[PDB]
Ligand binder design. Structure first.
Ligand code: NA
Ligand SMILES: [Zn+2]
Length: 78
């Protein structure tokens, strides 16, 4: 696990495609790690995978959409 620390999540985005409409910093902030494939990220807590990021997307907004009862998005790491 170890990924409760925000910098520890951002470390997983080594080869994340440079031209993405949502940045690696924002996705790490919204609880996601990188799977290493396409634009697919998975939550460290709830294990939900989200891909196909578009312009004007909320990282956090989509994470709550896929996982309304996620520990991280409901504040159980602050
Ligand atoms: Na999904
Ligand atoms: Zn989650």
């Amino acid at each position: 696990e170890e990924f409760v620390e925000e910098f520890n999540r951002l470390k997983t985005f080594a080869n994340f495609p440079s031209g993405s409409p949502v940045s690696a910093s924002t996705l790490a902030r919204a609880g996601f790690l990188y799977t290493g494939e396409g634009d697919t990220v998975r939550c460290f807590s709830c294990h939900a995978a989200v891909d196909r990021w578009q312009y004007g997307d909320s990282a956090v907004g989509r994470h709550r959409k896929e996982s309304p009862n996620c520990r991280f998005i409901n504040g159980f790491y602050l």
